[PDB]
Design a protein around this ligand. Structure first.
Ligand code: 3QH
Length: 847
């Protein structure tokens, strides 16, 4: 129409990419996908309750962990209900619904709502108050549960806009040639084309051109006939073309298209270059950069389209099925699993390994696989196992029906668990052969159902659209779909957040880049900071905006006075904001560190695995006091990081008593904690929160292979909460497992070889946290494995992915694992500050 064009440009600005752009396409899959997603969008918009979607209660079905009954076991929960200037405390029973708090409130004094003080967080719906996230949050941080008796939000604001032959012959392909605008880097070199028919990372068969000398234009015009017959090409198979001289470029093309058609015609594919196994390598997307990218020209021209297992082998099948996900299946293992596929079908944990034994390059076999899939009885009734469900969505599976069953299983995850695996489900869209998939439809649907899932979905897709040329197209189409159903209100918030971000990026692109060597932040530099901000504050940066890593917090006016440019190299901005909420329980500002220059995706990955580890521990009634702080990549190499209220780095606690020396003293940390604590009640509580948090980061770090850090990369609160930071240093550009130094030891009651009531508690907390994570070996393995394939371009080999197997003492028993971890604690005590002193030499100087 007309206003429908004005809308697209809004979406385009929100998305950060134009989805109707067709300058880097070779078929209509993307446009076909924007079409396929209209249905599930509209099917969910029309399906959600307008009142509960406007209010997004954040609730859980999980048991209330035992470490929180140790604060309300007496069946009484206090809830401060506030009004204008009058408030009232009320005692509640863990099972009282927010609706039932008109009977134990209005009587003491029906169409009102209970909203949390200073937040867009509502306590409503037919749910027990114990099961509210905000409630468990206060209980955990021993906080008063302050709410506000106010009227519900008008759903009318969520208004969604509206809106409306040779079939059995061997497969062949012709390599016409390749061409690059420029190349001179060395002398004359040799070069050839490797064509692989792939399906879920396995080479069905491979062919090569003869090698020619490497010139601007290299022409072959040769047909390459393959060992697979066209009728055998499975759906989702990939023609992967690579250039060696060794591996320099690659591009992929789906053999079968989105409409079940075999691919026919001429093609000129602009390739991706390698910098000398990675999710980028599997993309069907071509390089948009035509001016400077290698291209390959091809021609495609084809037409279309119950004996029971015996004892001993039974034990083999079983020995196979119980192995870790990162264990190769030999040719004998595959034959066993396949021939006894009906036995294999009764063990859900065997699905990944059975599906990796299917000869996808033989259509009769695929057909039996589908016949097999039609049963599925057990799988349908199996207890949802996320680590198992994720294993079917990695790079090792390309079949749509296989991956669809994994999604079918995800359908039963509740909102708060979706929130836990969300980032990783989004990353997993990178392993889908087609743009429209059961996984993508699912994320569309969960985000459209719940405002909080929607909020994060938006940011996660946008960080990929902003810094991934390989998948931005696919992801933009998915974000547009979501944006077209989230609602007018949310569309308005997202607009406010994007405006602020672009405004902050531009302020940083001016102010930043005025310092090329560590410490140098002058009055001149700040003058400009507080100046451009001063221009912005003036009826420009929106009234307010939801905090991207904390959607329930609305940030208001910028306290320009409190802003500065941080000491460090990349010159991040230290921003301070007034909370636009008046009913907020305090005066405190909102501190956000806005950085440009770094891709923060790797950090989000790390912090989310941490939120995952805490979720595991909760199942085992443990609370390790990790502080996984807000961190959202918000655009190309830019982002928002949360500032934790009263924290400093471990290095500066050492620095502010000694100096710029590596002559670290055991005392200063406990000295800092006592000094910063008012009463002795708060000091003991802080020694205790330190004990927990320290154990927390020790295991967490070790398990992830990131425990060996300089103490400037570690921080603590005035309350004893320890926490790691900047996970990009290490995963971007003599050793130890984690960080258990004399100062941490001093706080716990020891120095070199001793033992104490706190240190003994520390050791025990570790072991029970480590062993709880081993109960989830397979799961942490597939997460890590997936994290390295989609999060970091470098660490992308079999070897790197293995690290975690050794770390989780896979195969060994809880007993030996107890020793293995105590060992580690021991390689730490047997080094005091060796390493900290080395990192000081290494990093702080230039050694
Ligand atoms: C870019 C940047 C890196 C490192 C910092 C550290 C030193 N400061 C942080 C401070 C603080 N009081 O300064 C408070 N909270 C934080 C939370 C997270 C990170 C991360 N990652 C750093 C800080 C700040 C900003």
């Amino acid at each position: 129409s007309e206003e429908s064009q004005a809308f697209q440009r809004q979406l385009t600005a929100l998305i950060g990419y134009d989805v109707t752009d067709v300058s880097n396409v070779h078929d209509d899959e993307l446009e076909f996908t924007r079409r396929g997603l209209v249905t599930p969008r509209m099917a969910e918009v029309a399906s959600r309750d307008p009142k509960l979607y406007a209010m997004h209660p954040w609730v859980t079905s999980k048991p209330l962990p035992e470490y929180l009954w140790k604060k309300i076991a007496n069946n009484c929960i206090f809830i401060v209900i506030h009004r204008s200037t009058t408030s009232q405390t009320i005692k509640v029973s863990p099972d009282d619904t927010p609706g039932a708090i008109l009977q134990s409130f209005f009587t003491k004094m029906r169409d009102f709502v209970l909203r949390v003080c200073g937040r867009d967080e509502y306590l409503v719906g037919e749910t027990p108050i114990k099961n509210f996230q905000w409630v468990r949050h206060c209980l955990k941080n021993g906080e008063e549960i302050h709410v506000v008796l106010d009227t519900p939000p008008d759903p009318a604001l969520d208004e969604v806009r509206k809106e409306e032959w040779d079939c059995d012959r061997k497969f062949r392909v012709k390599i016409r040639g390749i061409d690059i605008p420029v190349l001179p880097r060395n002398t004359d070199l040799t070069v050839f084309v490797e064509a692989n028919i792939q399906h879920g990372q396995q080479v069905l068969c491979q062919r090569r051109t003869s090698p020619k000398p490497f010139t601007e234009e290299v022409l072959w015009n040769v047909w390459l006939e393959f060992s697979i017959k066209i009728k055998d090409l499975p759906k989702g198979a990939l023609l992967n073309l690579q250039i060696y001289c060794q591996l320099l470029y690659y591009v992929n093309l789906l053999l079968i298209d989105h409409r079940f058609l075999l691919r026919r015609g001429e093609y000129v594919l602009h390739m991706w270059q390698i910098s000398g196994f990675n999710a980028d390598k599997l993309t069907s997307a071509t390089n948009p950069d035509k001016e400077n990218s290698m291209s390959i020209s091809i021609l495609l021209d084809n037409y279309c389209h119950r004996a029971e297992m015996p004892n001993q082998l039974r034990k083999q099948l079983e020995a196979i099925i119980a192995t870790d996900p990162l264990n190769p299946l030999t040719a004998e293992d595959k034959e066993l699993l396949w021939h006894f596929r009906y036995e294999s079908l009764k063990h859900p944990k065997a699905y990944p390994k059975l599906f990796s034994s299917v000869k996808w390059g033989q259509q009769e076999i695929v057909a039996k696989t589908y016949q097999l899939l039609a049963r599925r009885e057990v799988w349908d009734q199996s207890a949802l196992d996320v680590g198992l469900t994720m294993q079917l969505l990695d790079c090792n599976f390309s079949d749509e029906n296989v991956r669809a069953i994994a999604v079918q299983k995800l359908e039963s995850l509740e909102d708060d668990d979706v929130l836990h695996y969300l980032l990783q489900l989004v990353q997993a869209v990178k392993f889908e052969p087609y743009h429209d998939s059961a996984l993508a439809r699912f994320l569309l649907k969960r985000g459209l159902r719940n405002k909080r899932i929607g909020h994060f979905l938006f940011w996660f897709l946008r960080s990929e659209i902003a810094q991934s040329r390989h998948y931005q197209q696919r992801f933009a189409v998915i974000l547009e779909a979501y944006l077209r159903g989230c609602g007018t209100a949310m569309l308005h918030d997202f607009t406010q957040q994007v405006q602020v971000i672009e405004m902050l990026q531009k302020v940083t692109l001016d102010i930043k880049s005025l310092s090329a060597e560590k410490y140098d932040v002058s009055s001149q530099v700040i003058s400009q900071l507080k100046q451009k901000l001063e221009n912005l504050q003036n009826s420009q940066l929106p009234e307010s905006f939801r905090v991207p890593y904390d959607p329930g917090l609305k940030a208001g006016a910028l306290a320009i006075e409190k802003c500065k440019v941080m000491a460090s190299k990349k010159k991040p901005l230290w921003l301070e904001f007034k909370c636009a909420d008046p009913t907020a329980l305090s005066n405190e500002t909102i501190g956000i560190i806005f950085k440009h220059g770094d891709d923060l995706r790797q950090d989000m990955l790390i912090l989310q695995i941490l939120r995952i580890m805490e979720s595991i521990w909760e199942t085992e009634s443990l609370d390790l006091c990790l502080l996984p702080y807000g961190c959202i990549s918000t655009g190309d190499k830019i982002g928002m990081i949360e500032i934790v209220k009263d924290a400093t780095t471990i290095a500066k606690i050492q620095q502010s008593t000694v100096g710029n020396t590596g002559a670290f003293k055991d005392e200063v940390l406990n000295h800092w904690l006592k000094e910063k604590s008012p009463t002795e009640e708060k000091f003991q509580a802080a020694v205790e929160r330190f004990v927990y948090s320290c154990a927390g980061y020790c295991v967490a770090t070790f398990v992830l292979g990131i425990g060996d850090r300089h103490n400037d990369n570690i921080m603590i609160t005035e309350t004893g909460n320890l926490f790691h930071i900047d996970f990009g240093h290490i995963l971007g550009n003599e050793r130890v497992p984690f960080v258990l130094t004399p100062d941490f030891l001093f706080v716990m009651g020891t120095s070199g070889k001793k033992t104490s009531p706190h240190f003994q508690k520390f050791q025990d907390i570790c072991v029970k946290a480590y062993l709880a994570l081993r109960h989830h070996t397979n799961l942490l393995i597939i997460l890590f494995s997936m994290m390295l394939m989609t999060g970091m371009p470098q660490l992308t080999s079999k070897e790197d992915i293995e690290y975690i197997r050794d770390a989780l003492t896979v195969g060994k028993n809880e007993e030996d694992a107890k020793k293995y971890f105590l060992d580690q604690i021991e390689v730490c005590r047997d080094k005091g500050w060796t390493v900290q002193f080395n990192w000081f030499l290494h990093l702080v100087l230039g050694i």
